[PDB]
């Protein structure tokens, strides 16, 4: 959807992105109340490829309607700055917002954030799309803490084009897709199970100061990340299901949502902790 740029305004610049700013600003459109959007611009400067795979990003999130992803206001292209307008998420990233309030939420609030991701992500993969970079970072909570996927794009990562999308996350990363390239839903789960020690541990970063090939390894040898500290064994057993070696034996997101689901209505179960 082409946004007339007199329906914009931009109101302050609350971030960088990969191509330039991310703001915060009001869209006014005829016959619609105004509404708070988050705005990402590209300036001058840019190839017509690098133009292409910035607006990727608005065609994909274009394609989805669900409350835990984040949802496309429209495009300006006739314009510059060109510009992509999303709902405004409030608290921004995940992760850098767990850090700021480390140990400030219950773990019933953890686990709400964790099942809106899992619902984002069982429509994601229902509508067969694999996101590939699933990262506390890239989640983005509103006001209500309301927890909504971001990051769309099809770029292949470098290591699958030309021997001569960016790098793959391997942290975050399956041992197949890193190992083969095959990235499928059930590797996005393993990379869920990263998002939920992320999320339990108040944004630490997944395997402290190890490094890639240090990771790659270790699981490689059946090292998992430990429970962190106050995590309910119920969680973290979860964590090492999304971390079966076999992808075939990961839990699927639906099946990761009705856990969750469980576990919010069985909070006494939570209480059990090593
Ligand atoms: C995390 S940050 O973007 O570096 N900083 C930030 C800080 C506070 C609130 C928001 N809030 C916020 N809310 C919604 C979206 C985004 N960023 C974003 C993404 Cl992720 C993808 C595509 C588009 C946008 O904005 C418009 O197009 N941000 C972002
Ligand atoms: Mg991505
Ligand atoms: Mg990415
Ligand atoms: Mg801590």
């Known amino acids: 959807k082409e946004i007339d740029v007199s329906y914009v305004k931009i109101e302050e610049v609350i971030g960088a992105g990969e191509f330039g700013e991310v703001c915060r600003g009001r869209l006014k459109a005829p016959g619609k109340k105004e509404s708070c959007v988050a705005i990402k611009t590209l300036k001058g400067g840019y190839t017509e490829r690098q133009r292409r795979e910035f607006l990727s990003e608005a065609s994909i999130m274009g394609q989805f309607e669900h409350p835990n ?5 429209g495009v300006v292209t006739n314009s510059m700055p060109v510009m992509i307008l999303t709902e405004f998420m409030e608290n921004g990233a995940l992760d850098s917002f767990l850090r700021l309030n480390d140990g400030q939420f219950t773990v019933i609030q953890l686990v709400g954030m964790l099942r809106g991701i899992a619902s984002g992500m069982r429509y994601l993969a229902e509508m067969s799309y694999v996101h590939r970079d699933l990262a ?14 971001s990051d769309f794009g099809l770029s292949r990562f470098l290591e699958e084009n030309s021997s001569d999308g960016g790098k793959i996350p391997i942290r975050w990363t399956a041992p197949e897709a890193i190992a083969f390239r095959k990235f ?7 990379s869920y199970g990263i998002v939920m020690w992320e999320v339990m541990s108040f944004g630490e970063r997944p395997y402290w100061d190890m ?12 090292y998992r990340l430990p429970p ?4 309910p064994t119920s969680l973290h057993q979860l964590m090492l299901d999304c971390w079966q070696k076999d992808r075939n034996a990961r839990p699927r997101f639906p099946q990761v949502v009705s856990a969750l689901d469980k576990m919010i209505r069985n909070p006494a179960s939570l209480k059990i902790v090593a």
Do not use: G
């Open 211 to 222: 490094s890639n090939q240090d990771v790659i390894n270790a699981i490689e040898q059946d």
């Open 184 to 190: 499928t839903s059930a590797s996005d789960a393993w």
């Open 69 to 73: 992803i984040i949802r496309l206001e």
């Open 136 to 149: 506390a970072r890239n989640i983005l909570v509103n006001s209500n803490l309301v927890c909504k996927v």
């Open 228 to 231: 962190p500290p106050d995590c």
